[PDB]
Amino acid sequence: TTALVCDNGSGLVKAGFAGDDAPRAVFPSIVGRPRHQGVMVGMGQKDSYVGDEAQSKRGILTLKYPIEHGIITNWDDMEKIWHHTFYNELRVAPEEHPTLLTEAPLNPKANREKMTQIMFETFNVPAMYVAIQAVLSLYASGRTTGIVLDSGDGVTHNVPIYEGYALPHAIMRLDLAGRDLTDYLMKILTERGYSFVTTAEREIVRDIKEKLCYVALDFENEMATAASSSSLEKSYELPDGQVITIGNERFRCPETLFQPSFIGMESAGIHETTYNSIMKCDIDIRKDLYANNVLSGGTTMYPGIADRMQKEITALAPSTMKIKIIAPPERKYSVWIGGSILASLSTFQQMWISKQEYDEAGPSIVH
Amino acid sequence: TTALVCDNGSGLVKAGFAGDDAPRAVFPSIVGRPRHQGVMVGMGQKDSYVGDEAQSKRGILTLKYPIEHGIITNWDDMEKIWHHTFYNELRVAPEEHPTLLTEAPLNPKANREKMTQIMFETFNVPAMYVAIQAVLSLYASGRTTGIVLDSGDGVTHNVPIYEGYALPHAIMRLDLAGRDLTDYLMKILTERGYSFVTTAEREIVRDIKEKLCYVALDFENEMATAASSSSLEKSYELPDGQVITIGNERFRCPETLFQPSFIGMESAGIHETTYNSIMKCDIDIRKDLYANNVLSGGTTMYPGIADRMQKEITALAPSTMKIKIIAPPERKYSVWIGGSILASLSTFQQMWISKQEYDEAGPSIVH
Amino acid sequence: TTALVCDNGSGLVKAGFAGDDAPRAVFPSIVGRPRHQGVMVGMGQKDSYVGDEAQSKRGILTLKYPIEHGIITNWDDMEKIWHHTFYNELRVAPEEHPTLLTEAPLNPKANREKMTQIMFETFNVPAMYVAIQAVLSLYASGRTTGIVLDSGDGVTHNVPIYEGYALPHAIMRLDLAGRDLTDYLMKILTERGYSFVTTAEREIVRDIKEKLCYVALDFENEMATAASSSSLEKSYELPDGQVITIGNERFRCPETLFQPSFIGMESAGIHETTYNSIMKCDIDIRKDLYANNVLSGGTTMYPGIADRMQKEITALAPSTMKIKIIAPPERKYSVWIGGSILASLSTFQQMWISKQEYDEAGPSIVH
Amino acid sequence: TTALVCDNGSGLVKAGFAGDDAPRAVFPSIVGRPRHQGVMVGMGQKDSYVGDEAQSKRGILTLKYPIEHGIITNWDDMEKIWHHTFYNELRVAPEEHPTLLTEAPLNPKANREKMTQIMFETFNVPAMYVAIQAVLSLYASGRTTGIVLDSGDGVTHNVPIYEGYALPHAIMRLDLAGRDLTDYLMKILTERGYSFVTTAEREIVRDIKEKLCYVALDFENEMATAASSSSLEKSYELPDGQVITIGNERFRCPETLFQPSFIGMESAGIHETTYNSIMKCDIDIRKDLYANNVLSGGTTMYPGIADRMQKEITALAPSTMKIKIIAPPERKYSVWIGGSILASLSTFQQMWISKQEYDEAGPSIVH
Amino acid sequence: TTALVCDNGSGLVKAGFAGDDAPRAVFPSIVGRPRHQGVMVGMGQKDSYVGDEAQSKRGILTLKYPIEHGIITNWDDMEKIWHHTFYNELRVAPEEHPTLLTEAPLNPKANREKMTQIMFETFNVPAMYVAIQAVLSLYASGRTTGIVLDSGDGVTHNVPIYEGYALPHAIMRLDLAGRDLTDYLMKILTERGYSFVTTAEREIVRDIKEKLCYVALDFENEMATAASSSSLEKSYELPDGQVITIGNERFRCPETLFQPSFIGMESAGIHETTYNSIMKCDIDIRKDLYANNVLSGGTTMYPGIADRMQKEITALAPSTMKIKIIAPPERKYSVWIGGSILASLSTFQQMWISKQEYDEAGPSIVH
Ligand SMILES: Nc1ncnc2c1ncn2[C@@H]1O[C@H](COP(=O)(O)OP(=O)(O)O)[C@@H](O)[C@H]1O
Ligand SMILES: Nc1ncnc2c1ncn2[C@@H]1O[C@H](COP(=O)(O)OP(=O)(O)O)[C@@H](O)[C@H]1O
Ligand SMILES: Nc1ncnc2c1ncn2[C@@H]1O[C@H](COP(=O)(O)OP(=O)(O)O)[C@@H](O)[C@H]1O
Ligand SMILES: Nc1ncnc2c1ncn2[C@@H]1O[C@H](COP(=O)(O)OP(=O)(O)O)[C@@H](O)[C@H]1O
Ligand SMILES: Nc1ncnc2c1ncn2[C@@H]1O[C@H](COP(=O)(O)OP(=O)(O)O)[C@@H](O)[C@H]1O
Ligand SMILES: [Mg+2]
Ligand SMILES: [Mg+2]
Ligand SMILES: [Mg+2]
Ligand SMILES: [Mg+2]
Ligand SMILES: [Mg+2]
């Protein structure tokens, strides 16, 4: 019987069988629709394109993320990505497998209740479960205690966890993520003269971000590099063949995580949110949380994140105590690994919500 | 066969085999229950935590003393601590050993009668005994005559004892103790800005009390120290990493024993209770009691107690006569030592209440 | 001109005009002082509270009996009660009236000599007299011969009196009384779990004593009632709203009068003191004393006293002769009635000590 | 000469002349600072905005409460609000008027001593006084006896008061208040999809709380209303023009006062704190306190508070006795009314601390 | 001394003295170069033609806009237009006057830094300033708050402005403008048979656009007019003498602003950009922005723009709130009027960048 683990974050769907080391199908959550009405006979006609296929044909298509800041914006688009994910990648009837789904904490009740309704009614699933991302990441680490910072494309979380358990009143979500940083890198990029207006080009600048951008230890040093131009300016090649040269924009893109005042948000940077999250927790456990702070997600991948963290949190907190930050490689797939490992635990099998227990007990029993 | 000596006071259980120099198992009488409902699979689940284990995880748990001012408040919690004490620390079937238990004087009949009922029915014990604390302390001193002041966490006693015998009409109990002094140090502590609201934090301030607080010879000198801040302010470190600095609060916490008007009680300080206890005794024996006044318990541990005693009692009593105060080191375990030594005496073995003599004669035969 | 009769016993002042059937002002001899220093503007400020007024506000005030076992402990407190008694209740300048005061027999010379000094110097009195309580009670009975047992709050007396006259060598005082019995009912009460530590609460347990407690004919029957719980347990309501249930404590409180070994006194019970008092008297008169034994005071009010007396004295004395005990209702005010009737006798008017005869003859002429 | 009464609580400053029925100037204690650096010439420039003015321009400004849980967090911000309060609203030189200031009980000594230092040195005041809030509320009621529950934005108190006087050992403070309830209504609000992240939006949700939220008699009935959606969902309009519909969130916001476990605090609800406060008081006075329990402050304004109180306290306390709760309309201004009435009393004029008596006697004489 | 205000947008240079009601010199930013090499002696020879002069001789000359979408494409052409603007129209040595220059927001840093370098080095200017267009338009309106839509020939902006200040993260630029609409009217025009291939003819079709084209309230009504040909077809005369008749092309040219899908751009129309700009602003201020939305520039001149705006924005936004659109006549010169009024303000004179402060501080100090 096994199980399917489906990590539905904005920007990437990671899906695959439980008990395995990595997800098999990893593709973007995009639903491409042709921008220009096309006059051929034979072509497509392909009214809708989905996932990596939409990535193949960006210059025709208007790309549309169905999921924004963790919240599902357009339901039938979502449904398309799931249907494509199941039959065209994993090759599987959902009626043969319980399915573990993922979601951000502190997220509107509509996402659980509609999600579950889709999975039972539209696909037919013998049982399923929807879990909090950060707990899955924490299982992937191999640890029971720690404060998780999960930064994906839609959303960034802090979830403190002590000896199992959890602290819901210290959970802190923040909308800063790969999508905000890509748009911020758009408008900062345009100051060199490089104009990326369209959805398709957004995905190009996502690529630039993913390769080139790094997090400076001290911002001022980056400013000095911008002042004298040596290793900081790097050449990147577009798909067209043009050459972009980016200097300070390389490192002032991800500086937004520490200084959200660059986007015009009053929310304190990710270091003050993690420290703030530690503050709201009981005086006893803070030492462990400081020692054990875990990183997950695509927007933790920027070289130089962990070191700046271990500067900034060490400047906020009392010096007397050790702040080890644990950011393991293969952290982008931490949530999916944790969904896998959780599905392979036998003590979890009682917790699946059954197709039957759903029809009789309602939508109210997902929580 | 030997025997088990179990010293059940509020705050600490001291237990071990008779005929030995110290108790082996010494842990707090706390029953931790998780405050926040924890979402993991595998964790615990550990609906109840007990003793030192509850101390390990204070920031999750709501700590609950099962015993308050010597009186047993919650019976099944007590039972848990005993069951944990026997099988998880002393490693012993109670059916192999007579068991000597302890209790404060002047204490409601419900504690003897329910206690004994638990020990015979729930654990099965071949015989047991429940003794008055101060008499046990007096055996530990190696002496037959003296007036015992036993200050534990729940309660403070004076028991005058002359040439063996006892004087029940001069026995005086007083609810001032480590628990009242910890709460008083809470609210006085909050005047520096340090806010300790929770049960877990109470145990932190118990730790502060145990290390830092001392009893001033004269209160006025302490006030002068508070006025010019030199040795009186000491730094203490929390488990978090924060630094607390406490000046006059160091010595005005235990001043409450001499001035219970700080808690709003009309009861005269411990020096006027000991002197008052001496007054109610026959004119013949007072000289011995004054010479031989013994100290026991955790709340006698504050540096500077004995000297202030030997000031204050010397100011109450007629000057013509010697007031020696005997406070031996290792006095916190005086009651347990006295239970040990008593269990090793052969002339005491007739006085055990037998499982058989209990079933036939009733609950009324504990007294 | 008339006269003032002032019955100053510990616990209650009974005062009023002579020639009248009862005292008008009857209130407790207490001097209330605020325990907690009060921050308002307007309140009181009322540094001292006295009498029934102090009874109105017990939970603020520390109550202090100025008179202990008949002996005056604190003089300026006494003075306060008298000054309040005169101007705030009887509404009278003491310079208009001779004043008859009361005192226990066998009582230190300081009480007569200081009392008289206060009445002449501080209040100004044209003449006064201080009388032995039991003689006043005997006048109240309407009889010339008898042995009086007067049990008040401070003290219990036996005074044998034959055909007028008196026998000073058979007068026997004993410190057992409402105050000792209230404290004894405190510590016996605490065995149900009911903890009354404070002066204010003492007055609550005085109330319990006054309503509920009775004197058992045979103690053993009371023990049997304690064994099977039927009419012996009665509900009493505190001022708070809590419910106290008291079983054997109802009747073993006043059993202390017959068995002072409950307080740890060697003094023989009130029945052996009355019998002993009869023994020290001349062989001729004993028959009358046995026939005519009179009761007075608040601590004679317990239902069942007279019958137990007429058991116990009948078991001590030779059976051949009638022991009638005379305990009239309205016996609590026997001493005050006797002071009234004595002040109305014309043959007594020569015996007043004049303000003038005092200044010239000294303090030595009170005796 | 008159006097100024200044009620400085977190969230609202109530100030005005003494002897008057209401405060004239009532505005929020906020210090607005522009978030985005503004490029105009002429604008403002207005580096700091204060009070109602900051409320006019929330979308530009970062709002900052200078006072948190009664404790002053940022001193120069405070100073700004006072300076604005005096010259821009009351129109008055402080050198013409003694000034009565307010503060929460049990509050760090730094607030009195720095406050007083500011008022004498920075403004110059001929004399001033700093009073405990609950006593002022109690004067406003027109009563001398009662237990005050004062819930403002920073903090909630219970202060029992008997016949004037006070009981400091029964005073109980609790950090639950309009500020905690607003943040709790934030995160519960976000489950409908309504995302309020910023300080400015916090003040919008404060407005929602103030209009719509009520306290349920029984929580379960509220749950039933949430289950079938009829009168419980109400429409509220934002300043933008969007429509928010809130159902169960209306009444489960203020349920936090009775169940602080919703915020993750172990502190017992406001009903168990008031009952607990009654318990620590002397047995004599509890009946009055139960009869006379007074309410004050903005966080007592929720419709349905008094009735739930008179359910819950009646379930804790012994049924035999009347629990009247007195919550007068115009209770939000109870503290300020009480400061007024106190300043108009002539017997209070001796208690002002003089500018002179301050310079000579120190900062230590505020207490 | 006064000042020069130079509004350099693509298509028209508006220049003149500050403190005046309109610009004196208004001519096209074109640099004409002869297409055919001309064989005469005496003619010209006039290797370069500039401005209105180039307009006089279009059929010989290749017209070349030096500035494209706000970005300066060819620097020495620009320089020519400035040099012609100064000496041949305004008649002025730039060394006598500070000069205020204009530029679009979000525009590459090269334009500020090179512009300033030209003005100081090539012309010599005692001081200058480069301002954001929309702020200048907002000063021209006489208002401090509003969201400006500035549509010129190169570029269209939305800049929201609140109470002075600004919101850089909500500023949105869009390349749709008179130049794109003229080319779109070219290719749509060619469907009647009218072939305009050349740069010179582009300026003819710009003229057609400026006179004849209007913005339809509803596009469908325009389609109906196209269907039955009555008032919608209008005759226009070319400079040659030929007659063009244009029906639906009159109104479907400017429909491109609302539907950029006509040019093949995915960018949402000007109504969704203005609404989107309102969305990114803080919830507090949106109402003002909706009330106060301002129009500026040549591509706002089409009759019927404001009404379609006040349809379309009213269909996007919540109906409950008033959307007034302010489009004043003489709005084409709004930016220049605002530059004038700003130069006449004395509080702005500190903000001029001095020739001296430039040489010492660098090119980096323009920002
Ligand atoms: N190597 C990288 N360097 C920096 N940013 C990255 C990198 N890889 C991806 N990202 C960013 O992180 C996002 C993917 O993170 P992911 O954890 O997969 O999000 P989610 O799980 O919510 O889909 C992308 O949208 C991208 O912007
Ligand atoms: N070193 C110390 N200094 C002062 N107080 C102490 C110290 N050790 C413990 N105590 C206090 O005394 C208590 C323990 O006394 P103990 O005699 O063990 O009580 P019990 O026998 O009733 O458990 C603690 O609760 C603590 O508050
Ligand atoms: N009805 C009663 N039942 C039993 N005890 C009583 C009763 N009335 C009062 N007493 C006790 O007797 C005392 C009062 O006796 P009283 O003769 O007035 O003493 P005195 O004359 O010395 O003041 C009280 O203190 C109380 O304890
Ligand atoms: N009508 C109301 N309904 C419920 N809550 C209110 C209402 N009015 C104000 N409050 C809450 O109470 C607070 C104001 O109380 P207040 O007594 O003025 O506090 P303080 O005196 O400490 O400033 C506000 O912060 C708000 O959250
Ligand atoms: N009366 C009009 N009707 C419609 N379009 C016009 C009209 N006047 C000029 N325009 C268009 O607007 C442009 C000029 O706008 P302007 O604000 O002067 O741009 P900029 O300030 O960027 O030079 C021209 O290129 C033309 O296409
Ligand atoms: Mg993720
Ligand atoms: Mg002990
Ligand atoms: Mg008497
Ligand atoms: Mg208040
Ligand atoms: Mg323009």
Side-chain angles (χ1 to χ4, degrees), chain C residues 7 9 14 133 150 152 297 335:
Chain C
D7 190 357
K14 292 169 296 296
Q133 293 191 351
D150 189 329
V335 168

Side-chain angles (χ1 to χ4, degrees), chain B residues 74 85 198:
Chain B
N74 199 0
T85 305
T198 298

Side-chain angles (χ1 to χ4, degrees), chain B residues 104-171:
Chain B
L106 206 63
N107 190 334
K109 294 184 78 75
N111 268 355
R112 285 186 188 82
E113 72 206 326
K114 296 289 296 167
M115 186 183 278
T116 55
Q117 184 190 340
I118 298 167
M119 286 287 157
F120 287 126
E121 293 164 20
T122 73
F123 301 99
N124 196 35
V125 180
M128 70 175 285
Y129 183 77
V130 303
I132 178 170
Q133 293 191 351
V135 175
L136 286 54
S137 86
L138 192 99
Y139 276 111
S141 311
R143 315 174 71 267
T144 63
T145 294
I147 177 172
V148 168
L149 184 136
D150 189 329
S151 65
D153 183 29
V155 169
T156 312
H157 323 98
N158 282 318
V159 177
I161 220 83
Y162 188 80
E163 196 67 40
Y165 302 108
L167 303 164
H169 69 284
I171 288 219

Side-chain angles (χ1 to χ4, degrees), chain E residues 73-363:
Chain E
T73 289
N74 199 0
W75 280 104
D76 62 330
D77 290 351
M78 188 56 73
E79 184 279 330
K80 287 282 160 73
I81 80 166
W82 286 336
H83 183 278
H84 192 271
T85 305
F86 297 131
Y87 301 95
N88 330 124
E89 266 90 5
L90 292 177
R91 322 190 156 269
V92 73
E95 298 88 341
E96 306 173 350
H97 296 290
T99 295
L100 167 74
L101 293 181
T102 298
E103 63 177 340
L106 206 63
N107 190 333
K109 294 184 78 75
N111 268 355
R112 285 186 188 82
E113 72 206 326
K114 296 289 296 167
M115 186 183 278
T116 55
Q117 184 190 340
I118 298 167
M119 286 287 157
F120 287 126
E121 293 164 20
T122 73
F123 301 99
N124 196 35
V125 180
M128 70 175 285
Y129 183 77
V130 303
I132 178 170
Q133 293 191 351
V135 175
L136 286 54
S137 86
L138 192 99
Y139 276 111
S141 311
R143 315 174 71 267
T144 63
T145 294
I147 177 172
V148 168
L149 184 136
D150 189 329
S151 65
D153 183 29
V155 169
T156 312
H157 323 98
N158 282 318
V159 177
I161 220 83
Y162 188 80
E163 196 66 40
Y165 302 108
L167 303 164
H169 69 284
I171 288 219
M172 195 160 285
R173 89 177 269 165
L174 177 53
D175 295 345
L176 273 162
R179 205 180 151 281
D180 293 305
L181 294 193
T182 219
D183 292 333
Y184 181 72
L185 176 52
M186 207 73 74
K187 72 178 281 195
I188 206 71
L189 208 46
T190 212
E191 79 186 342
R192 305 293 297 281
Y194 304 129
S195 75
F196 300 109
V197 61
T198 298
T199 310
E201 290 79 318
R202 282 170 71 263
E203 292 178 357
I204 296 157
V205 298
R206 189 174 70 69
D207 194 22
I208 293 169
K209 191 183 60 156
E210 287 189 357
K211 285 206 282 294
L212 315 185
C213 285
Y214 64 98
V215 172
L217 283 174
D218 210 312
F219 187 56
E220 26 262 61
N221 298 328
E222 303 323 294
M223 226 98 248
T225 205
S228 78
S229 279
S230 155
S231 337
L232 299 176
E233 56 173 4
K234 193 162 284 289
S235 164
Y236 169 80
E237 198 169 333
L238 273 47
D240 184 2
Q242 306 171 331
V243 177
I244 296 304
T245 302
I246 53 176
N248 64 6
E249 292 134 32
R250 213 206 292 183
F251 70 79
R252 81 194 297 191
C253 174
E255 185 68 14
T256 307
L257 299 166
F258 302 96
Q259 298 279 306
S261 309
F262 298 123
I263 297 167
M265 289 198 302
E266 292 194 11
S267 298
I270 65 168
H271 65 286
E272 299 111 347
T273 57
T274 191
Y275 172 79
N276 199 355
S277 293
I278 301 166
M279 297 307 104
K280 305 167 167 186
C281 295
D282 316 316
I283 294 170
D284 178 60
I285 69 165
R286 294 150 74 161
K287 87 194 156 276
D288 288 327
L289 300 179
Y290 282 120
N292 310 151
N293 73 328
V294 177
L295 305 175
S296 290
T299 302
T300 302
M301 294 303 288
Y302 298 92
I305 274 174
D307 297 6
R308 183 180 181 71
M309 293 281 286
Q310 253 196 8
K311 204 181 73 173
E312 295 181 328
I313 297 100
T314 295
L316 312 162
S319 304
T320 322
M321 78 151 296
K322 289 299 170 65
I323 298 164
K324 181 199 76 196
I325 198 159
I326 171 193
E330 297 300 285
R331 67 170 88 93
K332 178 178 305 191
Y333 306 90
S334 297
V335 168
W336 188 93
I337 296 170
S340 75
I341 197 161
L342 185 62
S344 292
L345 256 57
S346 300
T347 31
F348 173 80
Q349 309 179 340
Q350 302 186 340
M351 298 218 199
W352 290 113
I353 289 97
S354 72
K355 165 61 182 209
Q356 19 184 61
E357 191 173 2
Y358 181 72
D359 323 302
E360 299 129 12

Side-chain angles (χ1 to χ4, degrees), chain C residues 149-168:
Chain C
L149 184 136
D150 189 329
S151 65
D153 183 29
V155 169
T156 312
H157 323 98
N158 282 318
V159 177
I161 220 83
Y162 188 80
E163 196 66 40
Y165 302 108
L167 303 164

Side-chain angles (χ1 to χ4, degrees), chain A residues 216-223 251 255 308 311:
Chain A
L217 283 174
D218 210 312
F219 187 56
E220 26 262 61
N221 298 328
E222 303 323 294
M223 226 98 248
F251 70 79
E255 185 68 13
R308 183 180 181 71
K311 204 181 73 174

